[PDB]
Amino acid sequence: MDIDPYKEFGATVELLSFLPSDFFPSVRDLLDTASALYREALESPEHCSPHHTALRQAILCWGELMTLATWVGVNLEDPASRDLVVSYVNTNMGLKFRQLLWFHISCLTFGRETVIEYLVSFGVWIRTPPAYRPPNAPILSTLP
Amino acid sequence: MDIDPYKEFGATVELLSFLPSDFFPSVRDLLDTASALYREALESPEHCSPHHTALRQAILCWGELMTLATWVGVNLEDPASRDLVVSYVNTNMGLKFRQLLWFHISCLTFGRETVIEYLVSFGVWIRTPPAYRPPNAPILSTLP
Amino acid sequence: MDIDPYKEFGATVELLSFLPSDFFPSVRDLLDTASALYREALESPEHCSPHHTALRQAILCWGELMTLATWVGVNLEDPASRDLVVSYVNTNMGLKFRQLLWFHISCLTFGRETVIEYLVSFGVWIRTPPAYRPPNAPILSTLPETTVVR
Amino acid sequence: MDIDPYKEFGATVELLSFLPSDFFPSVRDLLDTASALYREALESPEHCSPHHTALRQAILCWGELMTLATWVGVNLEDPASRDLVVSYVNTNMGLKFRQLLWFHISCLTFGRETVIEYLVSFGVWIRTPPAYRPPNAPILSTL
Numbered sequence: 001m002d003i004d005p006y007k008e009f010g011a012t013v014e015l016l017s018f019l020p021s022d023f024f025p026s027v028r029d030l031l032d033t034a035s036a037l038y039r040e041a042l043e044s045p046e047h048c049s050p051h052h053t054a055l056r057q058a059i060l061c062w063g064e065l066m067t068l069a070t071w072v073g074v075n076l077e078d079p080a081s082r083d084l085v086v087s088y089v090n091t092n093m094g095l096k097f098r099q100l101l102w103f104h105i106s107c108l109t110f111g112r113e114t115v116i117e118y119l120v121s122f123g124v125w126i127r128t129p130p131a132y133r134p135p136n137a138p139i140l141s142t143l144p
Numbered sequence: 145m146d147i148d149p150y151k152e153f154g155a156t157v158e159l160l161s162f163l164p165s166d167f168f169p170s171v172r173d174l175l176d177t178a179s180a181l182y183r184e185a186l187e188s189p190e191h192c193s194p195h196h197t198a199l200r201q202a203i204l205c206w207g208e209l210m211t212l213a214t215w216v217g218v219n220l221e222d223p224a225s226r227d228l229v230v231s232y233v234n235t236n237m238g239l240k241f242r243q244l245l246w247f248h249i250s251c252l253t254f255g256r257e258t259v260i261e262y263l264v265s266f267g268v269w270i271r272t273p274p275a276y277r278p279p280n281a282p283i284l285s286t287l288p
Numbered sequence: 289m290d291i292d293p294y295k296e297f298g299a300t301v302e303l304l305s306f307l308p309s310d311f312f313p314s315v316r317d318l319l320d321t322a323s324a325l326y327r328e329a330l331e332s333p334e335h336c337s338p339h340h341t342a343l344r345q346a347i348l349c350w351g352e353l354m355t356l357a358t359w360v361g362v363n364l365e366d367p368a369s370r371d372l373v374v375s376y377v378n379t380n381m382g383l384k385f386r387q388l389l390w391f392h393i394s395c396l397t398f399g400r401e402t403v404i405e406y407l408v409s410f411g412v413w414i415r416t417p418p419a420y421r422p423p424n425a426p427i428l429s430t431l432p433e434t435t436v437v438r
Numbered sequence: 439m440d441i442d443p444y445k446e447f448g449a450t451v452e453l454l455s456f457l458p459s460d461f462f463p464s465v466r467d468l469l470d471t472a473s474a475l476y477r478e479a480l481e482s483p484e485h486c487s488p489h490h491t492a493l494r495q496a497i498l499c500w501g502e503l504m505t506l507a508t509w510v511g512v513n514l515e516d517p518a519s520r521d522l523v524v525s526y527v528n529t530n531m532g533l534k535f536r537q538l539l540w541f542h543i544s545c546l547t548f549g550r551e552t553v554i555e556y557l558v559s560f561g562v563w564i565r566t567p568p569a570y571r572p573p574n575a576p577i578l579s580t581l
Contacts, residue, residue: 001179003200007189035145045151050191056147057201064237065208072216072229085216093208162324254438262437264325265430271317273310276425282435289473291494295483323439333445338485344441345492349499352531353506359526360510369513376509381502 005100008050010112011119016099018123024098027062033105034059051104058100065093110140149198149244153251155260160243162267168242171206177249178203195248202244209237254284293388296338297395299404304387306411312386319347321393339392346388353381398428444541446488447550449557454537456561462536465500472497472543489546493539500535503527548578 006012025033034042034055041048042056069089076082106115121138150156169177178186178199185192186200213233217226250259266282294300313321322330322343329336330344357377361370394403406428413421431437444450472480472493479486480494507527511520544553559576566572 001175001183001186001203003186003203005200005204008191008197008200010189031145039145042145042147045148045154047152047194050194050197053152053194053197054201056149056152057198057205059145059147060149061201061205061208064205064240065212068209068212068233068237071232075225075229081219085219088215089212093212096208156324158327159324162320258437261430265437267324268321268430269435271313271321273313276311276427278427278429278431278433278435280435282431282437285436285438288438289469289477289480289497291480291498293494293498295481296485296491296494298483319439327439330439330441331445333448335446335488338488338491341446341488341491342495344443344446345495345499347439347441348443349495349502352499352534353503356503356506356527356531360523363519363522373510373513377506381506384502 005054006103009103009107011103011116013099015116015119016103018119018126019099020126021095024095024102027094027098027101030098030101030105031059031062034101037105038108049108051108055101055104055108058097058104062093062097065089106140110142114140150247152194153247153256155247155263157243159260159263160247162263164270165239167266168239168246171238171242171245174242174245174249175203175206178245181249182252193252195252199245199248199252202241202248206241209233250284253286258284293342294391297342297391298400299391299407303404303407303411304391306414307387307407308414309383309386312383312390315350315382315385315389318386318389318393319350322347322389325393326396337396339396343389343392346385346392350381350385353377394428397430403428443492443538447541447545448554449541453554453557454541456557456564458564459533461560462533462540465532465536465539468536468539468543469497472539475543476546487546489542493542493546496535496538496542500531503531503535544578548580552578 004012006016038052038055041052042059044052047053069086073082073086076085103115106118110118118138118140125133125137148156150160182196182199185196186203191197213229217229220226247259250262254262262282262284269277269282292300294304312318326340326343329340330347332340335341357373361373364370364373391403406426409426413426442450444454476490476493479490480497485491507523511523514520514523541553544556548556556576556578563571563576
């Protein structure tokens, strides 16, 4: 099964490649945001939303990958290759799960429409060469 | 965050551990079942069901886990500890994902309520002595 | 004080005295069954049912017996007498707790009248000699004779 | 399971921890009271009350503990560790059981609300320093 975790909502992994890899907050920051805003809903026994479902599954997935790598890292006595493997983990899995979290937390806080329009506008911005690029980048906000 | 992946569906890790660990089919068999029965819907851009959402996320998680494990095995050089880690990932995470895929596939196929009643019935059955229980193990079936 | 724990529920020990030890699952199996089927209700602050209240007391004192016997065995040093004491408990109090947990779980599941009818019929069966009774005992189950769910 | 035997009624082990361990009467006295006051109700075929149910289960299970401990002490070697076993069983199980019996008898007799208010008031009393602690410790009473 070649599944895209975003088209079920209205995006794709190539619409989120508009945002660089250095754009997405840390997994810690995003988990803290979730615990702050939607912890009751995530711990709830109800299908509050597909975003909640996917976010629960994503959180559990990350916990499981961390468990595995930690158990492996303790077993390993070589720190060189230990940093190698944790860098692989961070880069690949960490980036995809940072996008997954960002997308869902944002679609919950601001809206899927706003999030997709933001992706488009940020693609425009980051495509625009810097000499003609405004400094006031677009940003998701509930304020003027 | 203390999330139960089944509470939003009316079940619990305690209810799915109520069954033996050698009861749940292989993850390969379950992924084949999915590719056969619900591929067109999992690859669809629709919130067809929370079961579909959770199944997509679980498949992606299994993919990430297998990717990491294969990568570290290819970068390692000892089948001994390689078999150690594969046995660990199996016994620990493969069981969770067997439970998850079984739950969701069986739900989509038969019914959430039928699946839960099957869980409790099979648990009571396998816990009851043979001489005082029905002789044939319970089984889910679409055939009347 | 000559109390019967089932008289309050319409049964007696003379009615469950026929069911052999071979009939009741292990205490661990019954406790798991309870934890899975009625844990929300057994940890609930509500008098959900006399069966729930009796079940809560049975689980609490069985744990107490277990603590006692474990501490005793730990303080002992002869594994032979340790086996002897664990056999005494599993034969005397284990059977009684199995009776009790089974009665209450089965009542909650099926029905008091159903469980009592099953006890009557099982007594009829087990009192009957094997040369004259059917070989397959009567059965109390949530399933039909087919064990196939749809 | 994390079962609390007082939660169905409204108390907890934190609320009864207010009362010390030296407060609860002996199991003999409590069973004497239980007999005298509710023998015909505990021996009856009726769910007269959840307190009655719990009290029945409690008396039978205490008897099961007593049979076990008697058999063990008979099989044991020396009075030293025999009395050590007696001390342990008392300290732990007898304490828990007289807690339970006291709670249920006192409720059945005076009122669950009365018993909870009594626990609160006794906590107040036992937390009060002795210089300002009345000697008239709280007590459950009808008249």
